[PDB]
Amino acid sequence: MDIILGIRVQDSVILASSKAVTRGISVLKDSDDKTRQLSPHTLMSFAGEAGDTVQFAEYIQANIQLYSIREDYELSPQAVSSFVRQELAKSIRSRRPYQVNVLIGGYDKKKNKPELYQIDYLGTKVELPYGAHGYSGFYTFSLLDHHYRPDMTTEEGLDLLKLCVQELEKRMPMDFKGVIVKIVDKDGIRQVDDF
Amino acid sequence: MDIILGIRVQDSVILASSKAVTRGISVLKDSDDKTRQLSPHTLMSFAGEAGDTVQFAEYIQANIQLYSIREDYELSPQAVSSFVRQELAKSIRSRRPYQVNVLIGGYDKKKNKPELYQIDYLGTKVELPYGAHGYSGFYTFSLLDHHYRPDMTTEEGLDLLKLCVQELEKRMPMDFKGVIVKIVDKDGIRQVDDF
Amino acid sequence: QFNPYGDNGGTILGIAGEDFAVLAGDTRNITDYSINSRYEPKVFDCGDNIVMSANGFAADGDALVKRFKNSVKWYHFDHNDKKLSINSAARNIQHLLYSRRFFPYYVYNIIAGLDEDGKGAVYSFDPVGSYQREQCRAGGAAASLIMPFLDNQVNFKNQYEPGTNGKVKKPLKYLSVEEVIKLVRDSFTSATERHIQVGDGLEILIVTKDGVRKEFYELKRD
Amino acid sequence: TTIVGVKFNNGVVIAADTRSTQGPIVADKNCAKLHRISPKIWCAGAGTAADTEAVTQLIGSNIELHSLYTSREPRVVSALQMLKQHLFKYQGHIGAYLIVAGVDPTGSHLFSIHAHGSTDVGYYLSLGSGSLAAMAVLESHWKQDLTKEEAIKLASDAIQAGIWNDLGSGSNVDVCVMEIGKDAEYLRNYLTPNVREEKQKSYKFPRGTTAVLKESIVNICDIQEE
Amino acid sequence: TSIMAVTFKDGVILGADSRTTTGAYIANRVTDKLTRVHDKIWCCRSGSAADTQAIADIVQYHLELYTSQYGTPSTETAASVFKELCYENKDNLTAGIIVAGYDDKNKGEVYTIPLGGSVHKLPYAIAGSGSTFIYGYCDKNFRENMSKEETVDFIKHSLSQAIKWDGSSGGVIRMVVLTAAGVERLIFYPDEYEQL
Amino acid sequence: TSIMAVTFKDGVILGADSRTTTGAYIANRVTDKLTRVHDKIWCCRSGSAADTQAIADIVQYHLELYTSQYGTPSTETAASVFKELCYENKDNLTAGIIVAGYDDKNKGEVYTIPLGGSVHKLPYAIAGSGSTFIYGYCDKNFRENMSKEETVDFIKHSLSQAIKWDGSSGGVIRMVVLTAAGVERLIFYPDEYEQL
Amino acid sequence: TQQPIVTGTSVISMKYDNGVIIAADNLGSYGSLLRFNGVERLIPVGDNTVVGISGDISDMQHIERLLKDLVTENAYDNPLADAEEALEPSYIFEYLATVMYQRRSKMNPLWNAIIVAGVQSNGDQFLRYVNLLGVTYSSPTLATGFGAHMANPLLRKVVDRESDIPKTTVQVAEEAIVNAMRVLYYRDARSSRNFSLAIIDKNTGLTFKKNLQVENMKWDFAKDIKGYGTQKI
Amino acid sequence: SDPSSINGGIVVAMTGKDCVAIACDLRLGSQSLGVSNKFEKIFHYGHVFLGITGLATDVTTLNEMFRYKTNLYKLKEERAIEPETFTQLVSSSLYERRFGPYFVGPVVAGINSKSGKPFIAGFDLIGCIDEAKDFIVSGTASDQLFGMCESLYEPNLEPEDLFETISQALLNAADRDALSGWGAVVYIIKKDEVVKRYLKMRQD
Amino acid sequence: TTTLAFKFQHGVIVAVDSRATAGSYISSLRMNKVIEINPYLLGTMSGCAADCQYWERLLAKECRLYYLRNGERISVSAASKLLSNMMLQYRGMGLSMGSMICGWDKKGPGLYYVDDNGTRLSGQMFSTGSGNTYAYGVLDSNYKWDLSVEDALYLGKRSILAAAHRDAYSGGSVNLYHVTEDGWIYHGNHDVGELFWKVKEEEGSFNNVIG
Ligand SMILES: *[C@@](C)(CO)[C@](*)(O)[C@H](Cc1ccccc1)NC(=O)[C@H](Cc1ccc(OC)cc1)NC(=O)[C@@H](C)NC(=O)C1=CC2=CCC=CC2=C1C
Ligand SMILES: [Mg+2]
Ligand SMILES: [Mg+2]
Ligand SMILES: [Mg+2]
């Protein structure tokens, strides 16, 4: 799939992901949710080759859920991101690599801090205040570089995110059918139903 | 460029053409008029390779205007379409062919009839009640096949045209930035400023 | 580079009657512009009142038929000499073909016989294993020459009743075995005229409740 | 295509089959592959059918004008030279492979010519997809000092070999005999061994079978008086 | 193809096989590869038959026109005309020609013109696909100022071996003798040369 | 490369040049291409030096093990081991080997194993890039049951011509004589064989 | 996947009233080089079968060994090895055809075209073809390579269909085969004068003829042929 | 990509007793997309009829070209062109573009006004003439038309019988070709009257 | 091909064409592109015919085994997933399959799109094949949740007709299905040739076509 954005504000992480799914010259779906909850306080959005994306995301989800049950304990966003990176770095030298790029947004309950990790299909991990995959960053990073502060509220984060989507909608040749926005904070994961 | 539509109703011809112009991954313009007036009662919209389109359209325009001055007489839409076809058929076997597809909408003042001609870059001419170029027809022709009557008013033609654009906007992966609509009738050529 | 496939030409035709079925095919075998044999049987009696022909690449065609004949033999061993019905044979053949999905049997296969209600049955296959029951099917080199003629003369397509002018269709009356054989012979005579890979001889296998009968007819040898 | 050329005592004979193909499909069952360059100079062509015709007509036209200019009957060597220089110039892009034969005041001649412009001389020649089948017959039965009747037999036997054994060849046998001091005799359909058998059924339809929407008279006459 | 030209006491002899192939099919088994560009200037052709025929025809034209104006041309002059055509059109030609001729002044001369269009004057020359197999034999058995009969035997034995090993070569052995006496054509059939 | 093996009255002689090239550069001008796989079974190698060395080493291993169990192997047996390796690994090898050996029962035998892995028993054999130029010479000059001195001269003259025309061949001419008397190595330098 | 190196050309054959005839030349070509002149490409199996092989010679030698081993294996625990349970042409052919098709299915073919000629227990003539693709067919006449293009047309003039077989004698059939071999020598650049011929008859058994030569060749007419068009001398 | 099968279409001609028939489908497409169901492929210059299949731009171009040439022929000769003569004109005109050809499959049909003899002919894209007695076929369903014509055709058919034969040959061939159909037209031609009939067929 | 399927108030409609092509040659005039996996489960077929038949018939085996083990009908969601996992085993091996798994289960009516890449999508309306764009045009403009069974069957029928007309690789006949909570119901085979002329007259559509 195409556009996935992420921003880490004062007390939460916000992930925005496009709704479009294309097959041939036809848009099959305009309400697709390109994300999986890995744990109560960890969300992963994804984008890449068709089929591979969901298979990889669900495989990661299953592994983290297995860990949670075994230890009766939630892994930190940092620990989850490292596990995901290793799986991708393992994958890139396989016979048929998984062509999937991910953003991992989580709230660390121990440190009381939001955390955003950007990982590409090669297994290239970076912790960032805001991130994107593919061409999304080419349009949006200039706005984020300008407007972003680390003490922003969740509401201010959403307003800056709207501005990024508006710029994408103006300058991209691609109709991605808007975005689904989800917030990750101390209370867990929730979806912004009006955006 | 991408989408150009045409429909011939009772007493007029309506041409709809996209506003987008793309260069690389950036939309440079969202208000581009992909059309040239060849004569007071003849309009030609165009779509194809960058640069070639406007050069061809203006070259045709110059030739028809030259004819109009020389004879003090407006060529029929049929005569103009045949002239355009010959230029394209001449072009396709040239060293470097002009990759341009056109729709010619005209009102014949002699016969008191609207006329729509579809001509592709090979020089393939067809007179039609409604037409399109590229992928535009794949989405729209089913609607036109269903709803079109030959006794439709200009207002009904515009309503059916809106439905075609709405279907394009829903099922195309491509953001073409809406359309400029122009009407060709006995009184000449005018633009619908609100669409 | 080694090309494991080849084209042995030939053409086959299966027609399902009301209480019978025919499977016909020419006896010419070729490579490029040469004739290998003027009489190389292509339609086989596989037992259990089933006839079969695998047209295209002869080596793959012989291999498939050989394996199906084997499948019939083992079906008797494993299931107390039960008769293999035409629909069961058809489904079995699908799995034989798809076992080579990634290195296909380069053949267009047709089988013919009687269904469990005693009616005429023809099943047709693609190289990778898609199949379906049909009334009429031509396969191979001159398939495109023959099929339209059968649409017209077997199913009465585009034929209407005089006087009505397109309002009433020609009714779909059933064809006898003598009538079908006439259409088969004319189909191959016409195919022989306009297709260089078709000729030499025509062999027809007719299936009824009484068994499998054979008929042979000469074709032009040029 | 199968074509041959055979020399004999007092002249030369050429022959050809009558099948033309579009890949595996037979377009024409009675094609005429024996072309006339001049009255007593005939050629027969394989390869690209339009090229063999066009190149034969062109050289034949120029040969006629040459014959008129020189007040002499055309020679086979002139046709040969004009053909090869034309074909050589187009470097094989004109796919004409011809057997050229004829009689002139110099005597009887038989040449082959290939698309790139090379020519050969012989007493017996064969070209086309059935050349190998035909040449097998010629090598088996050809001899020096053949009579007219023996040469026609040998030529047609060579074409038959191509008809029966080559899929690119079929139908009938055409022959042209060019003897010294005589008019050339073109024997169209000299043999007819591939007549289609009677069909088992007549497919003549009842009148009214086909559904019709509109009928109209077509005006083919010019604009009328009064 | 197997072609050669050999100088001897009284003049020069050209020799060749008679096989023309299209792949493995023998299109002509009685080809005449010894071609005349002037009364006593002949050439042996190898490579594209279309190219070598077209060249030899043009050369024959040039030497006919030369003769009308300036008298009988030298063998060196003939080889120069061949060269000029083979060299200037090297990108569009595949021709390997051996030129051989007799003057009363210069006697027997042999020139070889390989693919590039270079010219090399030699006592004897060999060319064609079958020449590879007789480089050793010809080098060991060639002598200068041989007799006519010795030279005929030399060419016969040499081409016999070339034909024996090269599939592209075969048929009859044709020879052309160029002396003051005139022009003599020779032919030797398989039953003669195979048993050598 | 120019290699050959020739049977004669008293046994068999292997011969070879000594040039190894990498393109036009002579990587080694004193190569020993005559290699021993058993006491009186030797081979001449052509093609990839890596492939032919690896093969000859494996064959030497097989014949050493054969001898320990079953006694002295035949020349036919040695050629069979070569063949089995050359044939079964034909897709990954470029090796043209001539096998030559002496028994008291079978006397001198020569087997050639070209690229495909086929085996051909012969009175004499030639191989390598330079062999092409001496097919005619060797065919004309070979006789059965020659003397040792006649056979040495035959190989010397033959390889002399191969070296003369083939740029990939050259250096010294090495020879190995295989008889009941034993194993004799010979060498012939340029100043000797060039003036033949 | 490979490419053929040392090759053998046409193998030709035909049925006659009491048996079959098969023939093939003794040449082993190395591209355009006529390298080996003493190669036997007809390989008898018992006294009732002859296998004729064209194509790659190294693969031929491999097949030759498989057949030699097949005879050995058939004799094991078989008191009727020289009688009722002897190898039949149909057994030998089907074995080879199985091997050829398996090898092509592994993309590692035996680069050959094979004709198995013989006579069965009941006196019936056997003649069938198989090649590197595993393609099999039978006909009154069979030929490989150039033989298919030049020999079959000549042999089919003698036996055009099945009903002509009883009318064809061994003398006529042998004459046709020998004539075909001459025509191939005229026209196949990869052929030789020396050849082998085998007759398997239901009465007189297996007759194997070696060191045959093409004779009665026409070359005299070559003397008159001059130039390539206009040349007179 | 293949110019001879982008637009699709078919043409067939037949001889009868003192008559000829020529017919064509009406489809014009851009590969899979059907664009027009009124694209007639048969034209006439006087009493000589020409059907053209293949690349639509070249069909249109050649019609305009043969109209041009036949109108001049008539002005100079003071008579209408005959089918035999026109056939040679088509062949000449196509071969003059030997190395940059029109991607077409023309079919000539007509009756000689002097001899009264029915005439048909076909060409390849490069000008090679096929002068058949029985029938001529051209287009994307040429294989289908050969099979139908070869089995349905019989010589010396009367105009109203010939109509049924040619119509059924076209219709059923078109129904086994994805790129042909969307309507059909049949011309029945006699020495001094010509009838044109539009057939009813499936529109898929 | 052209296939479609959509959910609505009274279940789910499934409509497909019946054409099969081998290049430009129409190999089959009437091919069944629906598979009946069980009384409450359907599967559409687009792409390679062999791949569609084999894998969906293999899905029915696995859906049947589910019933025997659990004594309960498999869900549409689970069935579609099993199929998508099969496609994921032969990942990049060259399979061509596009199908819609239609049925009724405990959650109500269910519709899932599944293709050779492994993509698995839940949705109200889908259309696959070369003529899907033409079908979407009619569907999008006329679809409602409040459709009657009679009008819904017509919509899916009319949508295929639109595609069969324009798309050269779609046609033959229309096969209709209606899925209820009591199972699927076959609503016949409809020839396009006859259906076209009928719809033209009754509806007034296809004005540009002459008849
Ligand atoms: C549209 C026709 C696409 O053009 C549909 O998508 C159709 C779907 C479909 C048909 C039948 C059954 C189920 C689904 N697709 C095809 O028909 C399909 C298109 C195609 C072809 C090839 C590939 O890559 C391998 C992908 C997609 N066509 C086929 O599968 C062709 C090969 N079928 C035949 O040619 C064929 C011949 C035949 C003879 C007898 C019986 C069956 C036969 C078939 C299916
Ligand atoms: Mg157009
Ligand atoms: Mg035929
Ligand atoms: Mg030779």
Ligand SMILES: [Mg+2]
């Ligand atoms: Mg159609």
Ligand SMILES: [Mg+2]
């Ligand atoms: Mg359609």
